[PDB]
Design a protein around this ligand. Structure first.
Ligand code: OPX
Length: 658
């Protein structure tokens, strides 16, 4: 259908525009769709873009409004005092403000559907809420509506929620348009999605993006595909990957780099209310925090991630056990058998399960996939699925058998409940991945694994050396391989922190010289330098000119291939804020070749200082543009949990940054 009203180029300068005469007598029936293309690059704290209200004395609570906050939150109110209805639906982090310094045209579609009693909001091609109610309130069936307003809501004759921005186009339809019709509405998005709800991963949520540019020119990305809301482990999380062969313009359908199958891959709408939002999948194994590097010698791509056994995450991992037993000077994965109070088993050469109390092999072996065999026969467990049908989270058997894995809850043989690091490789640049192998312990038999720093590993330019940064209590622990990742050693670097989340990323400033930038607890990003390809590390220094919160945020970092202002350049990606994860910036630093000091010269605002920006990935694309894949929301805030399609990708040129 065509609209019943269509108008455009409305400037909202803290003064509402009355469109009652044009719209009110066109509204008919109980279903409506609002389509609005608008900009707001300097919004007020709380502002209404569109209102239908009863403006008369005594009816201040009879109105419909589409509103936004300077946080990027979008929502609606639908209120009628006589009916005793006060609906408020919203989602944080739904909007763009500016891109390349230009105000972004957001495309909003609100569907009010009387037949299905459902209100659905889309912004920029993304469904941000869909709410069904028992008692439906048609937006123009509000008692005594007599005003249609842009840039405010008229309540008792006064302008409430005054807006600053512009509405370039607005249309209203006397129909609830289908999800299919919605998908045909043209968009003006400044971003793309690589991973998204409903894709091959079937995860509704994503966190912890990475990006890495391969020698062939392919750009590879990995991510946590998070099933149980956006929660860290314990949960169900797999590691997914996607690549682009055209400088980031298009991306492949994701595949898994690391996955467990003890729980179903389910696309679930995780509850966001204050009673249930902390619901967490509690019996699934998971992967979390991935990192990528490419090896020049073998040509292999290598991906590491943390591995968590069923029900385990950082919060409850055994901090005094590596999960391995030391023997002769070798490390072997420990196992506990069904019924034993003790871990009386180890996994030896060729995956042979060996009894430590009897010093005697068993008829059990562990295959490459960490699956349990008895005399060559594959053992199985029944898979779980999750639901909130009952009114709370339930995890229950679903009738399907999957291979029995030592990382599962239901396994006959179970690993130590602590964190591990695993590695997988690809021989075809991300088209398929090998089965992962656990890395050995590096800090002794009685120390839990270090935690992988998400993002990129570092391939040194003048050699075959590969380095993945990791962190633990009191240090960064660099993992170093000179043989294509077949064997690893550690290089420990003390930091003045107990128990920091010291997520670190590295750049090679020049041959043999590595600077590592890392998250701290001081509100400042720190760094340290190695001049012997990672063997030894300097004291810690701090960057002035960028602020982080007390708890900090991952920082991504690259060494740019081209000179800027005649100098070698490093680019950092981080929120710049001491309040929350917002105010995303790329900060361009020029290197002083006298002393390798860095002058942070340009700060590029990714979007508004008040709009969300958390973990991020940056890479120089083969054409010397910059690709950024980032969490466009506050991933710390307990108000912005479980948002879909907030990890987004943009393309920038250096001239945009300067
Ligand atoms: O110099 S590398 O460390 O091999 C790397 C890629 N360099 C090319 C050089 C040519 C332009 C595109 C990027 C930078 C890291 O951020 C990874 O993307 C890998």
């Amino acid at each position: 259908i065509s609209p019943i009203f269509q108008g455009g180029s409305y400037q909202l300068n803290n003064k509402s525009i009355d469109i009652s005469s044009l719209l009110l007598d066109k509204l008919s029936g109980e279903s409506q769709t609002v389509v609005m293309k608008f900009k707001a690059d300097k919004p007020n704290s709380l502002q209404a873009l569109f209102g239908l209200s009863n403006s008369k004395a005594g009816f201040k609570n009879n109105y419909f409004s589409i509103f936004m906050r300077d946080s990027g939150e979008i929502g609606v109110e639908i209120r009628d005092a006589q009916k005793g209805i006060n609906y408020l639906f919203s989602r944080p982090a739904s909007l763009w403000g500016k891109h390349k310094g230009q105000a972004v045209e957001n495309t909003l579609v609100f569907v009010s559907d009387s037949k299905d009693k459902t209100y659905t909001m889309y912004v920029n091609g993304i469904e941000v809420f869909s709410e069904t109610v028992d008692t439906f309130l048609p937006i123009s069936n509000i008692n005594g509506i007599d005003k249609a307003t842009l840039g405010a809501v008229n309540r008792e004759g006064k302008e409430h929620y005054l807006a600053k921005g512009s509405i370039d186009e607005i249309s209203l339809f006397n129909k609830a348009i289908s999800d299919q019709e919605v998908s045909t509405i043209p968009l003006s998005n400044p971003f793309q999605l690589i991973f998204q709800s409903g894709d091959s991963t079937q995860a509704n949520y994503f966190r912890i993006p990475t990006l890495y540019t391969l020698s062939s020119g392919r750009v590879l990305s990995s991510i946590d595909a998070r099933y149980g809301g956006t929660h860290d482990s314990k949960s169900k999380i797999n590691i997914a990957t996607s690549y682009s062969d055209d400088n980031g313009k298009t991306w492949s359908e994701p595949i898994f780099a690391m996955k467990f199958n003890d729980y179903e891959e389910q696309l679930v709408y995780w509850p966001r209310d204050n009673k249930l939002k902390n619901s967490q999948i509690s019996g699934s194994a998971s992967f979390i925090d991935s990192s990528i590097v490419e090896d020049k010698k073998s040509g292999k791509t290598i991906l590491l991630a943390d591995v968590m056994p069923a029900g385990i995450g950082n919060n409850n991992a055994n901090k005094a056990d590596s999960g391995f037993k030391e023997i002769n000077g070798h490390y072997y994965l420990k196992l506990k058998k069904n019924g034993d109070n003790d871990f009386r088993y180890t996994v030896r050469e060729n995956g042979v399960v060996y009894n430590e109390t009897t010093n005697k092999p068993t008829n059990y072996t562990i295959n490459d996939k960490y699956e349990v065999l008895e005399g060559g026969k594959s053992l199985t467990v029944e898979q779980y699925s999750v639901d909130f049908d009952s009114g709370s989270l339930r995890e229950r058997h679903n009738g399907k058998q999957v291979p029995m894995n030592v990382f599962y809850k239901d396994s006959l043989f179970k690993v130590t409940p602590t964190n591990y690091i695993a590695m997988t490789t690809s021989q075809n640049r991300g088209e398929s991945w090998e089965q992962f192998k656990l890395l050995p312990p590096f800090l002794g038999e009685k120390h839990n694994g270090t935690y992988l720093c998400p993002g990129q590993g570092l391939a040194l330019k003048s050699s075959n050396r590969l380095i993945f940064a990791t962190y633990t209590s009191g240090e960064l622990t660099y993992l170093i391989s000179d043989d294509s990742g077949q064997t690893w050693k550690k290089s420990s670097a003390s930091i003045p922190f107990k128990n920091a989340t010291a997520e670190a990323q590295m750049v090679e400033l020049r041959d043999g010289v590595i600077r590592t930038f890392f998250r701290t607890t001081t509100g400042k990003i720190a760094y340290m330098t190695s001049r012997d390809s990672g063997e030894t590390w300097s004291k810690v220094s701090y960057i002035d000119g960028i602020q982080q919160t007390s708890y900090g945020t991952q920082v991504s970092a690259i060494k740019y291939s081209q000179l800027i202002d005649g100098k070698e350049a490093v680019i950092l990606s981080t929120p710049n804020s001491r309040s929350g994860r917002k105010g995303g910036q790329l900060v361009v630093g020029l290197v002083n070749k006298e002393d390798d000091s860095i002058d942070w010269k340009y700060h590029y605002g990714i979007d508004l200082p008040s709009y969300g920006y958390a973990y991020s990935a940056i890479t120089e694309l083969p054409n010397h543009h910059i690709g950024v894949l980032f969490e466009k929301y506050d991933s710390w805030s307990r108000n912005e949990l479980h948002l879909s399609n907030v990890v987004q990708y943009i393309d920038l040129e250096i001239n945009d940054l300067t």
